[PDB]
Subunit: 513 residues, 3 copies
């Protein structure tokens, strides 16, 4: 009762400091005007969330009883109003590009069919997530790709991440000298993994990382109707990695079902971490699209995993987000516990990219003299992955000249880890920013403006076949009483995870121009 006088008037003195700089020079005051008004607004929308929780059931009830009675009529309307909304909107994507963008919508159905025919419970599909999970990310993607204020936001939210890429050049220029531009990956990019792992833990300590997960999750919960753990983990995988998302719900992991656990694991493969998020940007990948792909992969993780292995028995656990809590004492412990957790994280990244990129040049040279058998060198591992994933590359709506070159990146990401796929993307990002020739002799040498947006989304996921060993061991270290359930669902989780990356990837193909 005594502490809040100090902390309150100081934060009320902050409200003095907001309105002080709001009066003079308001145009430079715009980010502080927007945030602190919303910072007042979201506390009000959360303090009245619990205080008016009585009226939350009292005001939602007289319509919902009428909505259940009108569901005899509404299920013939709302299920048919959206189909008319899609087909009318398919008259207005053809003006963008009739060639490939119809194939992307033709592929988005085909990825559903590739999961529905190969799901293990086809008749047990509860279609309310798996249609609306595409309906979320499409309504999410049409806001933040197609509409202009949504493009202004995630560009600016993308570009201010790019300023954090500069803030680590105080640390990486110090621990590694002024020559840190030499040896550019381990000395620039791996400090970004350290600095984002120390920001992610500060935001997790301050509750801000727990807060967005409870807001993105609850929006994704009620609209999809999944289990209340799964909406936390799938929305949690936007920010934290594949091995830290079930750590959010780790007291509740032995109690979930096999499909509630499958969709936890799939959402781990379907997205990237906020830790390695700035590693990918520093290669040269567009930050605005890669942030976009992480957000849309959370409803895609529901729309793929609840379609590929649906839930039957009972979602036994409710209200695990409010039970989800921290730990660290102060802020600078959490900035240290975030950095000391980045010890093994930048080490396992660095030795995989020694291990896996050498297994390129092994397999690019082993299959070279295996191809030299038939008078045919230029038979490489990269050429074989192009023709294996020529179906999935063209299915998500890539031009035929670039469908062969993007299918290397799916082959890089599925077999090897996705860092192999992103700088080999960023060798082709950076090559087209330079004004360069397309075909030097016959090599495609870059992709496009267009399908580098799609190949950004097709890789935004940890869904290599290598992380199946880490996620099994990561989940068995949490819930060892379900080791039979975790290991049996992991192989089903990659394909549901890789398609969940692709279901976001074709939505850019629908929304390309």
């Amino acid at each position: 009762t005594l502490r809040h006088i100090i902390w309150g008037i100081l934060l009320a003195g902050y409200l003095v400091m907001v309105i002080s700089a709001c009066v003079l020079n308001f145009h430079r005051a715009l980010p502080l005007f927007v945030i602190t008004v919303a910072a007042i607004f979201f506390v009000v929308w959360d303090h009245l969330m619990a205080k008016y929780e009585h009226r939350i059931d009292e005001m939602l009830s007289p319509g919902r009883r009428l909505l259940n009675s009108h569901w005899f009529w509404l299920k013939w309307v709302i299920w048919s109003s959206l189909v008319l909304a899609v087909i009318f909107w398919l008259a207005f994507d053809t003006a963008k590009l009739g060639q490939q963008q119809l194939v992307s919508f033709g592929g988005l159905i085909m990825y559903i069919v590739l999961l529905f025919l190969f799901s293990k419970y086809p008749t047990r599909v509860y279609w309310r997530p798996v249609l609306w999970g595409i309906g979320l990310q499409f309504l999410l993607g049409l806001l933040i790709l197609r509409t202009d204020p949504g493009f202004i936001a995630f560009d600016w939210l993308g570009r201010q991440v790019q300023t954090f890429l500069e803030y680590t050049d105080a640390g990486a220029s110090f621990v590694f000298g002024e020559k840190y531009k030499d040896h550019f990956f381990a000395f620039k990019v791996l400090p970004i993994v350290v600095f984002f792992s120390t920001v992610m833990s500060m935001l997790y300590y301050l509750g801000l990382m727990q807060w967005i997960i409870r807001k993105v999750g609850w929006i994704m919960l009620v609209t999809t109707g999944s289990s209340p753990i799964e909406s936390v983990v799938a929305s949690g995988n936007i920010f934290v990695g594949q091995t830290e998302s079930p750590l959010l719900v780790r007291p509740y992991l032995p109690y979930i079902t096999k499909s509630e656990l499958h969709a936890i694991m799939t959402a781990g493969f379907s997205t990237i971490a906020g830790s390695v998020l700035g590693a990918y940007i520093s290669f040269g990948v567009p930050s605005s699209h890669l942030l976009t792909a992480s957000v849309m992969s959370a409803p895609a993780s529901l729309a793929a995993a609840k379609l590929f292995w649906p839930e039957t028995e009972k979602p036994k656990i409710t209200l695990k987000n409010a039970m989800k809590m921290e730990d660290s004492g102060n802020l600078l412990e959490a900035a240290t516990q975030g950095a000391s957790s980045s010890i093994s994280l930048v080490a396992n990244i660095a030795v995989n990219l020694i291990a896996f990129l050498a297994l390129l040049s092994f397999m690019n040279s082993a299959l070279s003299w295996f191809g030299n058998m038939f008078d045919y060198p230029q038979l490489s591992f990269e050429l074989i992955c192009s023709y294996i994933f020529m179906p999935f590359s063209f299915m998500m709506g890539v031009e035929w000249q670039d469908s062969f070159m993007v299918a290397r990146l799916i082959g890089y990401k599925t077999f090897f880890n996705e860092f192999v796929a992103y700088e080999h993307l960023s060798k082709w990002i950076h090559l087209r920013k330079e004004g360069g020739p397309k075909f030097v002799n016959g090599v495609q040498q870059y992709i496009s403006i267009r399908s580098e947006i799609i190949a950004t989304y097709a890789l935004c996921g940890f869904a290599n076949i290598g992380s199946l060993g880490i996620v099994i061991g990561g989940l068995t270290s949490m819930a060892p009483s379900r080791k039979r359930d975790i290991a049996s669902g992991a192989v089903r989780a990659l394909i549901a995870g890789t398609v969940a990356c692709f279901m976001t990837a074709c939505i850019a193909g629908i929304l390309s121009s």
Copy 2:
């Protein structure tokens, strides 16, 4: 009974080898003449410590019975003889510098008052450590700062550490090539942390590190009268770090009191390790002063922590130094176990200085555009820490032109780890060794000869708010039955630790010239 014939005559053959080179060319024979005579002498002073332990109680008793009877007179003399000794000596520090050196003595009382008014047991203070703990380091500091043979010793003991800074350039030039001068921190300085962690474990295996702790501790024990574990840990923190000092007494950690545990933790924050001791010297910090600060911080750790959280119940454990033992089989295991323990030690240092130095340039740029709100960039994190710790900087006797610039280092050391504070000190050490301008436009650009001695001592401690997370987890991993006692004393340990660094820092301010 058979082995000591081999080991004895070989070491007696060493005594032949001493006196051989002692006869011819004695002037080059001085370090071997001094050590091996003392090596005979300290074995004699320890073999007769146990053999004449009967007379140790028989000869100390007839005076101590008279000393207890004369304590009716001696407590009016010795408590008043020292006060007359101080005030007469305050007539002979003013000739050095009357401006700031009186403020340092004015600050040393003020740091006592800042702990005594904010101790939790003010009436329960047993003043025999907390006055003599300043009386030790002052008698220790006046010997090794003021007097000329004490200056010759710790300069030479400082300069021969600087030769170990060269000995790692066989290893760091090999593991990291001849280009190791590029990327100077991780490739020169972090091998010094490895090479000093492998020397510290060899000296711990050979007993030499256990021996100085039993000699510095027992001198600090009887003169302060603290608990016999605490005099081991506080003197142990001279050499080993904050997370290895309670490992010395780890079978005895669940049995200590809450204040015996507080002063264990505070001495961990109040000092530096011998591991990172050569990291600090390689930046450019004077080695003779930094070794001096580590020695004086052990009685300062008693004089601060027994003042800030005194002991009431009962010191239940005696003779834990002789119970303190190892482990490793041979010497070269201990040179490996010291190097393999330096895996996480140079890794957690390297990622913190990526994490924390980026959180400078985050907060130096976040508060820049927060200052740009009020038409005021150059509002940085560095400027705010200057005015927050302008009290403590000027209190320990720094010039007003340099009190603002040194208070950044306290702000660097309290919030971030002290490696941030030392190279930002060594940017200003190295800038004044070059003949440079003081004010370029208005920036102070270095400090002085004088207050770089004080700022050396104000930072010789692990007392950041970040290590409160490591020391809690480091002590809970040892004595998990006292987790409530450890976590409640850690916040009290930093302030008692940061002042214990400062109580050494003002003594250089008294002894500056």
Copy 3:
């Protein structure tokens, strides 16, 4: 019953792919013709190993009953036929070099005598391993050093490892930039340790590493008659390191005898890993000889450890190779679990070579001013190790001009780890490949063609006194119920391990020219 139709006809489609490229251009088709015929052949020799296991006892029995009856005659023949075979062959090594190659054979007996006089069970020696364990590696060494098709094999098998040294330059040029030739050890050589630790685990997952151990082991088992765990571990130490070889038999480790455990530990010291095998080649060491030394050290490990601490009680365990099994799910988990196990492996190597190479230049400078006492600098640690191991260096048949310079490498390998010994060898490999002067002033400056083959074999082992701390802790972490047995045998294991390296080293001295 359904899966083998897919996997069979695909591998039968591979047999189509073999014979397709076998018809046209057979000269380029030679490695694929040799392997896949043998790949058919070894499956046939293993499918008929179990199917005709009934006739394996039915056809071996009518001769063995006659062999036991003729052993009254055969033990006077075969024990005397080999002695006549040796002495006749000692008439035909003198034509190669009568000076030093007789000393190598004179040393090979002397190493037996140095183990037999200092074994703890001299009367309990079962001489059937310890004579035939030299008889294996001599028959193994005469095939692959002396004979010309055996030289063609291990050169080509050596040179195709040298191609894997190039394959890591896709990974090390990426994680560490194009400037990775700068800082040549940690940025080129330590990725080779990563890439070979990720190949070794893939070959262990595919069974190919388990297969050669079951073939080299069973050949070494029946011919030596050791315990069936020990023939797995000693042959296993050809490939995996000292801390992963008892991990092969870790469910069976509390049941072995003290001498079965001694020879497990000794074989760990006597050989090198396949992990650090390409680290040694990248320094400049000849790959064909270093692969040769790893193969011959497995029978040398039997011939030394069963001689130095023989087995008395009972070999209680049989058929542990077939019980030896994995783990990892797919291949790319095992390529990740091999890389993530190389985290601590390249870190403990990198900090030891910071720790140990600095303890050269410490001891090279501490003994320098200890030598300056007697007007004698150039008294170094390197000079003392030359005269300590002048016996063992000349005993294995090195020229007297080079016996002093090679004995530094034994002193480098016994006290410090063998990476110190190999690049200080490869400073002298690389110096003689350049056309250089032998004596600049008096320094030998390289060795020879000849004794760099011997010094390659004298170092192919983990038998430093530093790894006694890792192997004790590595075995106690596996079988903690035998900690008294492991710690008592480790000191006996180094000397039996260092001689087992030397027993291979003198065989090159016999086979030098």
